[model samples]
Target: MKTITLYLDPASLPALNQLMDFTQNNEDKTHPRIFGLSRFKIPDNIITQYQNIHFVELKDNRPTEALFTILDQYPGNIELNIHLNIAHSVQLIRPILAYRFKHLDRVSIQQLNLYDDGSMEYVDLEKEENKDISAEIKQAEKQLSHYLLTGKIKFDNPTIARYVWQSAFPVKYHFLSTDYFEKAEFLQPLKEYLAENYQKMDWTAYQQLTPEQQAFYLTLVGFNDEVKQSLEVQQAKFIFTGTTTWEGNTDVREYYAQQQLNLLNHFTQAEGDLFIGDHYKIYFKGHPRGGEINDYILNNAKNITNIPANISFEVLMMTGLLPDKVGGVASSLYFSLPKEKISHIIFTSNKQVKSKEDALNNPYVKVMRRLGIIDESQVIFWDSLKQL
Candidate 1:
């Protein structure tokens, strides 16, 4: 039996609705496995209709072993039906590529709004060329046009037209055939496996320096151990920074320009750059976060020193996640790619770390340990993770 695993997320609810309809009408009833990363569960009415329905739940605080156990129990020969969003690609891709799983079958990818009013459309002509056709869609003549040139919906794109197929730019749904997998030893999107996977992520900056982190920063701009040794590793070597709210994407390009008048103004004003060493050259990279190259940090940092060439967060998220091509999440993607391992991260956390007292039970600290996002012991947080 071909088990159809639906890689669902916060933004792809519509796809599930469509899949249920498709399944109910199909000649062969494929067993369904719904693994969603968002907080909510599938509504009872929809899932009740199907048999052998598997919904995998994940929690940040759950023991890693428990999560693996669920994966182990899922049926093999999966027909991956992905309803994803670009920003959250790591949520799913990390498991699929990193795991040695049961033989994969005809893999299918689709996108649906996990939470959205009906206006958002995942497929059709307008999404292709990006036109404001929502109004045109209101008029019933839409069928007249497609019927004039009607044909079986096809995904003509080779492995997702852009970095990878996302909902905003749908390919009328696509499938990866056995020949598709066999023809290429590994597809371009999957090539990132050559680098370190998130399962092996090291944020040594949060702890004592690892040899790997040391070698990386030195070679990043071509410095030797002697040169690194000559230079005192001051508090300036570590930095911290973050941002406000972003449910509505929190696009950086829209706001980065406002702070463009004096590039360093926002950096320092965020109360982020105070730790900078007065004499440091302060060589700022033209663009940092895939943001990097740096000064200042939250005190602890000790982990991997080299940037894994095979790791691609964009490819991971865009590989059939919600929407990357036509926009939204793609615009807000913020990350830092350093020569060796990640130097720092600038995302925000609600865990207030006012002083040493608050630091005792910092929520951010708990998150880092739980997600393995960083080594909490090494980095200092006045609190911005970086001087963004």
Candidate 2:
């Protein structure tokens, strides 16, 4: 038997989790493979540890074509699993087709899972309890035809325009409001995250840590000697992870960026006086997939140092460089860090933006809070940031 997992993004927690989950299961399966149709460059080193998991990048631009490409790769009794953001995902059609495709010899879909916002859930595609979005797809096809006829991307109705855009090409995966992640499965990667980067702390008190533990933090952050020494001696006042702002239309994108920048600046300016104390600096680490930090954010803020996007906040957390107050509007960093490292994990609300956002009260946040993955006391809301 062959076991395959298909994912859209290579760097996302769900996609990575899919890979991890694939390795630990299905003993009878000889071929363990993952296929990604990704726009972002997947760094080679991220999944090298999964020794037996074969990963292939699919260049096909369409969802059905991509599925056919994967299906052609293996023959005889296959169990295919798709790990995707389902509601907005066109790739969901791939599973639907596989489930309906006749004359295929026992090509079973083992799992149709949704993963986003650092959460995962299983979707049981029972024949009776299924969404008939066939009408929506037909309507979207007509809308897409109008775009081709008029050469206009914008429409009066944003949902139709957005659906047309997706029908045209696979956009970035957006969050599903559903909270359907396994607690144990979700936290399984926490162990990997904590263990993966602890050795990066080599420069921290070399006399105390093992030779295996001693590695340079400066190698990644590119800090000067004085800055490096200061970090060595004292923690950062705060470390903020970036959020994706370029997701919507021009006005929406601008608003998103400005609002997020304001949120970041709020902490850099006020949070120190409110929480950490005087003579403190805050570090800004870009979201791995959150594009680049804006120029205004870098040039305008006081004591706000920019860390490259390539260096994940998890690496910093494990290295003892993380401060008590680490935040983002909606970041996996809030959940990805180990339990011991959870302290004052501030979440600045983007609900004000009125875009489909990762809000403080979202199902994922509620689930994480309920599961004790994130504590109520530790989580500081955006409005509460000023009060505290």
Candidate 3:
């Protein structure tokens, strides 16, 4: 049996990168067997190249029960060396698991460097103005202390929850039974272990790594020299980053699709004359998870060029695939590269109900700006881009 079993979602590929970084230099240097539970397709490259790394793709999307399902399959005598992110399912699961599998030897958890527990707020105006309700939402949230306390809502269903809770009518909040799981005295030992051996993926420290070192982590997903060489040969002056699809609401989903198309259409049309000089090429990179470049955008934007979604923006930047100018609605790609590499960044918003200023200050971008990771002067909004 492998030394460790990791329960992770393949959609969040960056977490896998962090896992590699975490385990690469360990004294044992043991590879993990990943149990992937995601709707998104796991990339073939990951399954093929990393032979030492075993990946078991499970059908169950809901992770809370999935953990127990895996445990049930194994005999009680089995050594349960389970590994997972701190933000896996819920706080209750950790203590619950510890109690359930008292035969287990260890439970290792690492908190990923995912920004805040908040949903990634886009630069769309209608969305921001109705971001949150303070009094009732906060009070109700405080009343439901266990679940709502610590950015837990952010991870539960990120994109859907963000917009739905923002503008829509208040949905009824249901409380889960907290009697047995909450009061189980068995939690103390697990809590003590976690407190003693907790490790957080440091955001700043990871970003500070040299581009080459950064690229090294790509091997976890089978990014090799040949793949790097193939990507390096491709060149694009203007790169348009894509966003993940909005699930759970058709109207909101269609609304974002239109926003994506608008941004793409604007980029495709203004390429030669409007934004940069005539000779520069353009490339569209879809989000790794899925549906960044939809059928609508493909049919409409004739000039739209695409790069493989498997290759991350950071790797492209490190390998010199990205040129001097890059534009997108709202992407971490804007700050993925060093300040010197990307000379100009054009930000395109969805529908302009409010000032572009609010869009620029979304939680992720805002935190990076505060830490001096992003420069405000370098970013050019859609309205300003039109003026030029």
Per-model TM-score versus the true fold = 0.26, 0.45, 0.50
The residue-by-residue lDDT of candidate 2 on 1-388, one tens digit each, is 6666665543344343333334334242445555553433333543453443444454332244545555666666876665654333333333334443553456755655544423332122111123333444455566555643433333433222223333433233323222222233433332232232112112123234343323222321232354444456455456666666633345454465565666665555545323444465677766666554445455555667776666555335334566556665665456545455454544543434332334545555555665566666655554544322
What is the Cα root-mean-square deviation between model 3 and the actual structure?
Answer: 11.9
Tens digits of per-residue lDDT, candidate 1, 1-388, equal 3445554444332333333333333333345555553433444554565565656554431113333455556555443444443334333333443332322343223332221111122111113333322333322233322321332122242112222322122222222111221233324223232122112122232134345533432232223454334223342322122222222234654343222212233233345443233332232222234222221211112220222212222221221111111100111222211212233333222335344344434443332333343344323332333334
Query: lDDT of each model, Cα atoms only?
Result: 0.31, 0.46, 0.43
TM-score winner between candidates 1 and 3:
3
Pick by TM-score: 2 or 3, better one: 3
The residue-level lDDT of candidate 2 at 272 comes to 38
lDDT of 3 at 385: 46
- Which of 1 and 2 is the better model by lDDT? 2
Distance from true location, Cα of 67 in model 2, Å: 2.1
Local accuracy of candidate 3 as per-residue lDDT tens digits, 1-388: 3244454542343344334444343233344444543423335654454433444443332345545545545443433333332223233233324533453354322222221111122222123233343333444334334322232333333322322221212221111111211232432332232232323223343355556445544554445676555445445456666665433145455555566665555555654223444455656666666453454455555565666667666445333445555666566555344445454444544443133575556554554454455577655564554321
